[PDB]
Amino acid sequence: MKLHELKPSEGSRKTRNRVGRGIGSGNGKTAGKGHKG
Amino acid sequence: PKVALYNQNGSTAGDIELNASVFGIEPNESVVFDAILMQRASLRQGTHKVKNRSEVRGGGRKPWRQKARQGSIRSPQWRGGGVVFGPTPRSYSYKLPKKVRRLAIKSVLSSKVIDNNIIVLEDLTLDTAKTKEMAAILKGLSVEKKALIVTADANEAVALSARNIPGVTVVEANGINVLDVVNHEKLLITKAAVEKVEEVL
Amino acid sequence: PRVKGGTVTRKRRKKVLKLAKGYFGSKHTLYKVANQQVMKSGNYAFRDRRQKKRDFRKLWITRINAAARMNGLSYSRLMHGLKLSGIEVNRKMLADLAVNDLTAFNQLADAAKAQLN
Amino acid sequence: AKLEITLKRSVIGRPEDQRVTVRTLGLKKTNQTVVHEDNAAIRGMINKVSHLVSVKEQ
Amino acid sequence: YAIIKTGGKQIKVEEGQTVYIEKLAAEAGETVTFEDVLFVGGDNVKVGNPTVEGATVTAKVEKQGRAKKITVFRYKPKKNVHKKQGHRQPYTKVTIEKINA
RNA sequence: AACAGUGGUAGGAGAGCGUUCUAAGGGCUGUGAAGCCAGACCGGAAGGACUGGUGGAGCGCUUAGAAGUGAGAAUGCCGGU
RNA sequence: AGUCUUGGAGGUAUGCCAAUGACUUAUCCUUGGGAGUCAGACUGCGAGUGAUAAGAUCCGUAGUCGAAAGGGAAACAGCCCAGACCGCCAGCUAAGGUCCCAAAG
RNA sequence: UACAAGUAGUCAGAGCCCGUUAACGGGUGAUGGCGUGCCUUUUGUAGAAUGAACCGGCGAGUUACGAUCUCGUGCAAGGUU
Description:
The PDB classes it as ribosome. This is part of a larger assembly, with chains A, B, C, D and E. Chain B is of the alpha/beta class. Chain B has one domain. Chain B has seven helices and six strands. In chain B, helix 2 crosses helix 3. Chain C is rod-shaped. Chain C has helices at 7-19, 31-69, 75-83, 93-100, 106-115. Chain C has one domain (1-116). Chain C is built from five helices and no strands. By secondary structure, chain D is an alpha+beta fold. Helix content of chain D is 33%, strand content 24%. Chain D has a three-stranded antiparallel sheet, with no helix packed on it. The chains are: A little secondary structure, B alpha/beta, C mainly alpha, D alpha+beta, E mainly beta. Chains in contact: A-B, A-E, C-E. Chains C and E meet through helix 2, helix 4 and helix 5 of C and strand 8 of E. Chain C binds three RNA strands through residues 1-12, 15, 22-27, 29-33, 35-37, 39-62, 65, 74-77, 91-93.
C-alpha cells in the first residue's frame, strides 16, 4: 500500500452531516429542528 | 520465502530463508490503512487555541446608555472579538488492539517482500564513519531512492554515516514500524536483524 | 486551521451580475436586486416557452381563416372538410405558409368543398 | 367478453372509495385503457364508478 | 417542393436548402430518405390522401449537434423551493437532394 | 431490452461541487506564479477550462486526512460611499 | 384492498355478520433508528340536529388549499376542469366557449 | 428615445450598427402577448404584518465525558489492558 494510493475499507467512513448551510441540502433555515419544537 | 543474500561489496551467490509466518503473510490492506491513519495521527501536537467570548479583554458593561443598554462589545458578531466554537487544545491519539498492530507490521513486511524491495545483507560494518563510504555502498547495491536500513543493536558507525544523505534513515531491530517501512521504497536489513524481528513476532 | 474566503464570494456574485447585463439602472449594478431579477427571468422564460407554442397556433388559425374566407368557406367548415378527406394530414403551420407563399393552395379548399357536399 | 375500460375523467376531487376502485381496476393515467374478462364482479366495480369511465365490449 | 413529416412534425423543403431535424439517428455522410410526403407542390401539384403514394425525398447528413444551452430555473416565492437545470437539445443538419423518387 | 414512474412545505434517506491545511506521488512558474479585468467555451447543478490585458513571485494535479467549511436578511458589527 | 359470489340472520316500509370461492389488484405485520405535528381554513352533502328544510347548534361525511403550478369563473388561497422531468413554430380533447376587443358558427 | 401609463423582465419581432472560444453569431431595440419584489410569519399577504440606503469584510449545530443504535476491521467463547 503506497502512501499516494490509500483507500479506506468500503463503508467504514461516512461524511459528517453539516447542518445549516443552505436550502439545497434539506437542513437549511430551520437546521433540521423544524419550527418551535 | 527465500531472498538472495547480499554483501556490502554488492555481490553474493548465497541465499537465506525468511520465516513465512512473517514474510509470507497475505497483506491485509484495511489493517494497514488504519495503522497508517493511527500512526500518522498521534504525531500531531494539537497546540491550538482560540479565545472565547468570555476570555476576551473587557465586555462586562452593556454598551449603549443614553444622554437603552444591550449586549457586550465582545459578542461573536462584533468586530472586537468572541469566537463561537473554534479550535481547542486536545489530543488526537488512540489505540488499536495489539493483534491488529502485529498483523499490520507483518502485512507491510510481506508486501515489501513481494515487490522485490527487500535486500538482506550479511552485515553492514564501517571501519570509518565517512558519508562518502555509505554513498559508495548504496550505489553498489543500486539504491537510488529513499531507503530504510535496519541493524541489529544500533552500531554507531552506520548511524553516523548516511545521517546526512537526504533520503536514508537508519533504525535498529525494535524500532521498525509501519510508516518508515511504507514510506521508504527499499529495505536494507542485516541477517541478524532478520532473526531478531522474526523472533520478536 | 482557519479559512478566510473572498474569491468564491466574488466569483459567485460576479456571475449573477454578468447575467443581469442590460437591465435598467440598479438592476444591472447591485447584486441583491440583480439576483431577484434573474430568478424572475427564469420563471418567465419557462412560462413563455409554453406560451410560445400556444401563440403560434393562434396565429396560424387566424391566417387560415382569412385565406379560407377568401374562397367562400370559414375556418371550421374548411377544417371539417379537410379532415373528412384524409388530406387533413397537412398541418396548420404548413397550411398557413401555403397561404402567404402559394394561394394556389385553393386546390385544398376545392377538395374540402367537394367533400362537404 | 373482453371489456375495455377507459378512464375518461380525472380522480381529483372524488372521494377515496372511487379512487381505490379505479386503482384496483388498473387505471392510473387519464385516457388510459385496460382489458378485463367479463364477469359480474368487474361489472359491479364498473357500475360503482360508472360516471367516471366509458366501457365498450369487444 | 414537398411537405415531409419527420420529427412528429412537418417541414417544407426545396432542393439545396439546409434543414435541422430531430436526432434522426444516422451518421454524418449517410443518405437518409423520407417516406411520408404529404404534398408535392410546384408546377404539377399532387395533393395526396394521408400521404402522396409513391413519393420519397432523399437527403444527406452533415452533422449531429446540440443547440445552444438553455438554463431552466424555477422557484416558488416564500417556500424556499429552487431548481436549476441545463439543457441542450440534439438536432441533425441535413441537406435536401432530389425531392422525388 | 420491456414496462412503470419523476409537483411539493415540516421532515426522513442518497449522491455530489467548491474552500484552508497536512501527507504521498507527479508537476508548473521570471520565455512570467497567485490575485484582478474581459470574452460569443464546457458540464444536469453546485461549478470548470482556454485566450488577451494588468500583475511581479509563488502556485496548482492525483489519492487520502483534518476542519475556525460556502452568507442576502439577525432594527447584526466594522469600514467605504 | 376492491368487487361479485355464498349464505343467513336485522329492521317496521338501506344496512349487519360470517363466509370461501373466485376476478382483479400490490399491499400489510413485527422489530429497530430518525422525525416533524397538537388554535387549521373554506366549499358541498346530509339530516344525525329545531332528526324537520332549515337557518341555527354542533354532529358527522367528502373535497380542495395548507404543501399545487396550468385552463375557466373580468380580477379571485378553499368554486369548476385538471396534478408541471426537460425541449419542439406537431395533433386530439376537458371545463368553458365561437359579432369586435379575443382563438373558433 | 419628445401621443406616451410600466415589480421594468420575459417570449415574438423589423430596422440599424458590428464581427466571435464560427456558433441555428454579438449590441440596441420601434411594436405585440403575458406578468401584483426578496425574506420571516400565518389558516390565509401585493397590503395599511416584519426587516433591509448601497457596497465590502466579519457573523450561528462544536469539543469533552457518559448512554444507545448502524456500518467496518481483528479475534472469537472469549475479547481486551
